[model samples]
Target: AQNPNCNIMIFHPTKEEFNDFDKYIAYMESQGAHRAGLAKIIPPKEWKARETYDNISEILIATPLQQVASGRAGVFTQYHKKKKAMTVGEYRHLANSKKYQTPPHQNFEDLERKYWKNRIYNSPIYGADISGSLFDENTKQWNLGHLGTIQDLLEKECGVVIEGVNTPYLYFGMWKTTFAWHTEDMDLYSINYLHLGEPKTWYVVPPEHGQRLERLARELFPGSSRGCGAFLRHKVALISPTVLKENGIPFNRITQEAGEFMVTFPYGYHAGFNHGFNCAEAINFATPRWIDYGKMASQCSCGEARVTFSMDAFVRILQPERYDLWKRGQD
Candidate 1:
């Protein structure tokens, strides 16, 4: 139910259930991935990774064509600052580049490390939102998480792999790094599992109040042709829990620590910042409950048209089995 006053829900799964990867995958595939609710999973030890930052950076360095963002860049300043969008190799090279060093204070090597660290600290950059399929087939980093389970299920069920949409991707963020408020593609559900590092704070508004939030967002940042672009870009005013409550919209908050998974339901509006340097993996998926929302999203004229793919394609594949189930009142 799209209850207007709903709040976030957190789950602490038993060690046995959380450890059983296959069982957890099945449960999420059934209803968890796509619905109008917020879910936080305190994952079991099995889901946690043993890799150090060095190990992850090593893997990232070798990945080619990874997208990079400047910590100092935002959508508003992207045009003016022209933040560098380079491959992993290019980023590594620039981090070590002699051109960036001022030799009086620190040695070149120390300066290089300090430079890169400061970039992460001051102006964060992110990329390499690698799909699970890409990671599994190409990288040794596949075993770091259970994203492959959902990847396999989507391919097996939908007969089509939706890159960036259904695919899992890695996130690297430092303090103040932000992802603006928005729903998952086509109002599909999304799961974000923090692999390592400090906590990330999240604020969520349920689907029932999503439209109202959008209107308030427009009022907050008036000159947009689309839905809350200013808010998404951090160009507008700050949106806090108090601000939302003042508008009579219920919002929930969570500080997602390492080893926790945050799930955003279809059409729920959410946004947050990483408390410090953090690494997380996220993916999108849909269940039967997502069909109508998916349809509406695909047809919507605003941001959805640009970010989402055809729900009809998945529905076509789903039709044979789902049609009969719906007729039987089982859907």
Candidate 2:
């Protein structure tokens, strides 16, 4: 009746390590963190969260998903598939209300309902830009835009304003509002910061088994992949742990709490659901090592959804010392 046991490691970085976090992330990966596909990094205990935010009353329209997700294809199947509007405050209230939350006892069947899920992945197209509404800029580590991965490459080189990848996105969710399985665009890495709310649970498959899991998707959803080879890029599938265990693919599950960060590796597949109402800010970024993997994302028809920024455009501007090598492998 319940899922199998899985564990994800947590890293408590010092304030200094947190600032130069890309190096710390590289180190974490060296020590087998990449095998888990996802990592949990808790902010320094000394750091405190402020009481209020500017966008609490702001309205966001989101697509609705029906019912508690099962450990199968039904997770993506929609009962109504309608859209709804709600302010962050209303979402938070309804999320925590007695009507939604189950009592400690059993027999909670009457609580069936749909979920309003909104991810401000593309700000301009979605609504007003509430970019840094949940966390503060003054805090060095929490200032996501200033982080090395975002600061060093993508922003420094070729680009248009790639909305979600370059800009931080705010995601709102209530209990069972789920994000389906997928990898970051062009196979670049991603960082998800839970600014405020109930815990978000994540299930990650390490990079090694990434292929096996993908093969499973191809076999299971032959029709979808027939049109686009990498069907997971569509973010429409969810495979249960039972299926994974049956297939002999290893995975880990982690709970992301408020003030913590979940960093995903290149080509790492991840999916999760919220425990209750919560808000999280996430962004995709790249390190130099990501260049080769990004190259492999290939044609969107081969199926990494079309990456907005041009990697060739980015490599073109490299300075003399490394320009020869960076451009050498542009296939």
Candidate 3:
């Protein structure tokens, strides 16, 4: 799609080629992760995150597995009053406290296996960092890919750790498990890697038109408002690309295969559905360029202000470092 509003691009880089982090970062920066609608990277087989972190089953099969109350859980319905949303730990506690009996057909193990195939697993609210136990130090380095590049620099230059800001969220999805249209926090960049299983199809809207789309979404789903906990409790309306196009908005599509990584730029409105069973890992991050927005985002209705550092506090901690690089433009 040559539509100027279409900002998505695909990159095919062999594992050997991407091993050179400098080259990888150079290419991605030149392409503009902050401006590009979306970038997909298909890595060589040997270097796939799935290959190194194949122990996903260990985590998924482990004790205290969570289950969403509905098969179609979305940001909109996560906080609904009628929905009995429970974490695995919370569910276990409730079951034990209430002396609840497990129905013969509803064994936890069976439910887990079924949910793996039948429902969406929006994980990382639990034990999110499986990389430590799953991969050796050497192999874990490869997991960084391109997003790690900016993270590393931010830590070194600004003393800004990305841990909570861009924490990794794992996803296990079967056919039709969908994430509604939304941008990353504070308009930060996000990178998602499909480790194993079926491909995912993504619909992306350029940053320039993200607000317009949000307005259209509000018009279509009048009850739900951004940042309102009660309003967000309802299932979000699914808006198709055709709907966006019909309204004169430009967008692009990407069918991400196993071993491929998709990067969404700041403020880019993107949504997608899993084609079939799949496991993926995603994290958010910021560059110096994102600092101001990060501050503003921390205050946004959807942002968890508790997780972010105050702007004054950040500048104080980073001090002259922030001044030298951003204000003074010192190399």
Best by lDDT: 2
lDDT of 2 by residue, 199-247 (tens): 7778798776788888887776677778776667656576655567777
Candidate lDDT values, in order: 0.52, 0.61, 0.52
Candidate topping TM-score: 2
Q: Which residue pairs does candidate 1 place in steric collision?
A: 69-125, 71-123, 71-124, 72-123
For all predictions, the C-alpha RMSD in Å is 9.9, 8.1, 9.7
Expressed as tens digits, the lDDT of each residue in 32-119 for candidate 1 is: 3323357777765544344344445533522322223332322221111324355444444443345322233343334323433443
Better of 1 and 2 by lDDT: 2
TM-score, structure 2 vs. true: 0.73
Show the lowest summed lDDT stretch of 10 residues, model 2: 119-128
* Residue 158 displacement (Å), model 1: 9.0
Model 1, position 170, has a per-residue lDDT of: 77
lDDT string, candidate 3, 107-157, tens digits: 433432342343344321122223322222365434643344444646776
TM-score of every candidate: 0.61, 0.73, 0.62
Q: How many clashing pairs per prediction, in order?
A: 4, 0, 2
Model 2: lDDT equals 0.61
Model 1 error, position 209 (Å): 1.8
